[PDB]
Amino acid sequence: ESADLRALAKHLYDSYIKSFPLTKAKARAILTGKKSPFVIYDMNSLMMGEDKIKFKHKEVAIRIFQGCQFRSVEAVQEITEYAKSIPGFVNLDLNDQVTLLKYGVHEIIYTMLASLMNKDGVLISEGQGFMTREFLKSLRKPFGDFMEPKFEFAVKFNALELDDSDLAIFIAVIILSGDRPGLLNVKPIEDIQDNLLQALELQLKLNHPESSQLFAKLLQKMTDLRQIVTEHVQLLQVIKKTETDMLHPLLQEIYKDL
Amino acid sequence: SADLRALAKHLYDSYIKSFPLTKAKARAILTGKTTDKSPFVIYDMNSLMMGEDKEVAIRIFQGCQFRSVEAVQEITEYAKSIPGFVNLDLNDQVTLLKYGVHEIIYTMLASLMNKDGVLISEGQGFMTREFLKSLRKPFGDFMEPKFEFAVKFNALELDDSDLAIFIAVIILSGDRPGLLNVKPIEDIQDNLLQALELQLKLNHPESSQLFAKLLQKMTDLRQIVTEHVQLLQVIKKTETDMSLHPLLQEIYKDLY
Numbered sequence: 001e002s003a004d005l006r007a008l009a010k011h012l013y014d015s016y017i018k019s020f021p022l023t024k025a026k027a028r029a030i031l032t033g034k035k036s037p038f039v040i041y042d043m044n045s046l047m048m049g050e051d052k053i054k055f056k057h058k059e060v061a062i063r064i065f066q067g068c069q070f071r072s073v074e075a076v077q078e079i080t081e082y083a084k085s086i087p088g089f090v091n092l093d094l095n096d097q098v099t100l101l102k103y104g105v106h107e108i109i110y111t112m113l114a115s116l117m118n119k120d121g122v123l124i125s126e127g128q129g130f131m132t133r134e135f136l137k138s139l140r141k142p143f144g145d146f147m148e149p150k151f152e153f154a155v156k157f158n159a160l161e162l163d164d165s166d167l168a169i170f171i172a173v174i175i176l177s178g179d180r181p182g183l184l185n186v187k188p189i190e191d192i193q194d195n196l197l198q199a200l201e202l203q204l205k206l207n208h209p210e211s212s213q214l215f216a217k218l219l220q221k222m223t224d225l226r227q228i229v230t231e232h233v234q235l236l237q238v239i240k241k242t243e244t245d246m247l248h249p250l251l252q253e254i255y256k257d258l
Numbered sequence: 259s260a261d262l263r264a265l266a267k268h269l270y271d272s273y274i275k276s277f278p279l280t281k282a283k284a285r286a287i288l289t290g291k292t293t294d295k296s297p298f299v300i301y302d303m304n305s306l307m308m309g310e311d312k313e314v315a316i317r318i319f320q321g322c323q324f325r326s327v328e329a330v331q332e333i334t335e336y337a338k339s340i341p342g343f344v345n346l347d348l349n350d351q352v353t354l355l356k357y358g359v360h361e362i363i364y365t366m367l368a369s370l371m372n373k374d375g376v377l378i379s380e381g382q383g384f385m386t387r388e389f390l391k392s393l394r395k396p397f398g399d400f401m402e403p404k405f406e407f408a409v410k411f412n413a414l415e416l417d418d419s420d421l422a423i424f425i426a427v428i429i430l431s432g433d434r435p436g437l438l439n440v441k442p443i444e445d446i447q448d449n450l451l452q453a454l455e456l457q458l459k460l461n462h463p464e465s466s467q468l469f470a471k472l473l474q475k476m477t478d479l480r481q482i483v484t485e486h487v488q489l490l491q492v493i494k495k496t497e498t499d500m501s502l503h504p505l506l507q508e509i510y511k512d513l514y
């Protein structure tokens with residue numbers, strides 16, 4: 001049903017624009033130099049970055065990694081608003097909505113982080129800043145190897161040259177996964193995903209006509225994505241049992257993990 | 259189009275050549291069809307001893323490792339039949355096998371499995387899921403993810419002709435860590451994906467987005483492998499005296 005697959009795509013894109021203040025288009029305009037980000041390439045610029053840039057968020061490697069978590073928690077609420085705009089989502093059993101978000105959000109976080117990344121570093125504070133990949137590697141060794149696999153993933157993901165229109169449908173596909181553990185009613189979830197997959201496939205065909213098997217290549221990117229998430233959780237589980245620099249009891253409660 | 263049906267059939271024939279127990283034969287065994295013989299059932303320590311013909315948990319885990327070496331050989335033989343594979347850089351041939359072999363082992367183990375157990379010794383035996391759960395920690399947990407995957411994967415109702423192409427798609431992954439020449443591998447996988455999409459459309463005409471759903475299962479496959487390497491490390495930390503096959507040591511060296 002081609003025309004309402006197109007309407008679904010347009011609806012998702014419009015909701016994506018509504019929910020996500022920094023889009024890939026804007027992020028790319030900055031990364032390609034096509035305003036300008038304050039650059040964090042060393043400890044000096046880091047310290048100067050912290051004073052100039054708001055950082056609405058107590059020693060460097062920790063300051064950075066905690067800041068990342070604070071920002072991810074913010075992203076969870078953006079992803080949640082977006083999910084609720086996916087037709088059918090808010091009428092799912094509430095338990096199932098929670099389950100799909102519980103497992104979906106991490107995956108979406110790394111997908112959207114790729115939009116902010118290139119081989120040389122990552123956009124931070126809504127494109128107001130740019131932290132270099134070298135500066136991150138230079139860090140403190142449980143922390144120098146924490147973003148590296150994300151840069152690896154991002155470089156291969158970004159080679160697909162997806163745009164916001166593509167990503168809006170791909171993110172929806174991720175959320176409506178009938179394979180999440182503990183789901184009560186898989187039927188409407190798979191029904192919704194079926195239509196999203198059809199919309200994604202058409203979108204990719206129209207948006208990237210010269211791009212053979214792009215649908216398949218993208219779906220298989222989900223394998224590396226889940227691996228990133230899995231290995232990131234066990235890095236958090238290592239970081240916790242070992243890191244003393246992680247009210248604050250009230251803060252801990254908000255940012256514990258999402 | 260081109261020539262995707264010939265490619266599909268070549269892969270199917272090479273798969274039949276390389277793997278001695280097909281899903282069709284496995285299913286005929288599991289469901290009591292008269293084309294095939296019924297299996298001996300291992301369901302407790304008693305029947306295990308009579309099925310075999312010093313601690314059982316280690317001996318079973320070790321038995322599985324050993325059949326996995328045979329599986330690695332069968333898969334390598336199959337990979338050579340994949341058009342373009344033998345033309346790739348030698349180091350890349352090694353990398354693709356290194357990372358692909360276990361995802362293939364788990365795909366193919368699903369063929370041997372139902373919710374209640376797994377075919378063993380080329381389908382001559384059947385070992386119950388409940389018996390495996392009864393093994394000593396940390397050996398009572400090691401097959402569970404594989405059964406959980408098998409049940410979900412088997413719901414796709416793929417046959418051997420579908421699986422032949424899927425396994426080839428798995429091996430020809432341009433995203434494997436440490437590949438030197440990614441382009442020629444993606445060129446090959448492009449053709450395999452085209453063949454797979456067409457095969458599922460013709461073989462499963464009433465099954466919507468089966469192609470997408472199958473590809474999505476590669477995500478589960480990777481997580482089985484990831485979680486298996488974790489378990490091996492727990493085994494490493496907590497057991498002694500266990501030998502390991504050079505093929506396996508080699509695959510597992512620097513694996514995730």
Ligand SMILES: O=C(O)c1c(Sc2ccccc2)c2cc(Cl)ccc2n1Cc1ccc(Cl)cc1
Nearest residue numbers: 063064067068071072075109122123124125126
């Ligand atoms: O607050 C930020 O914008 C930020 C941060 S917070 C921060 C950045 C630099 C120095 C100290 C804190 C961040 C940290 C890392 Cl290691 C990687 C990416 C980071 N970002 C960008 C980011 C964007 C989106 C999401 Cl979900 C997570 C992080």
Ligand SMILES: O=C(O)c1c(Sc2ccccc2)c2cc(Cl)ccc2n1Cc1ccc(Cl)cc1
Nearest residue numbers: 318321322325326329363376377378379380385
């Ligand atoms: O030799 C076998 O056929 C076998 C074995 S070996 C074995 C089985 C029962 C008692 C003693 C050894 C095996 C063990 C587990 Cl835990 C699970 C599946 C197993 N199988 C079936 C099997 C099929 C294929 C692959 Cl690559 C690995 C194992």
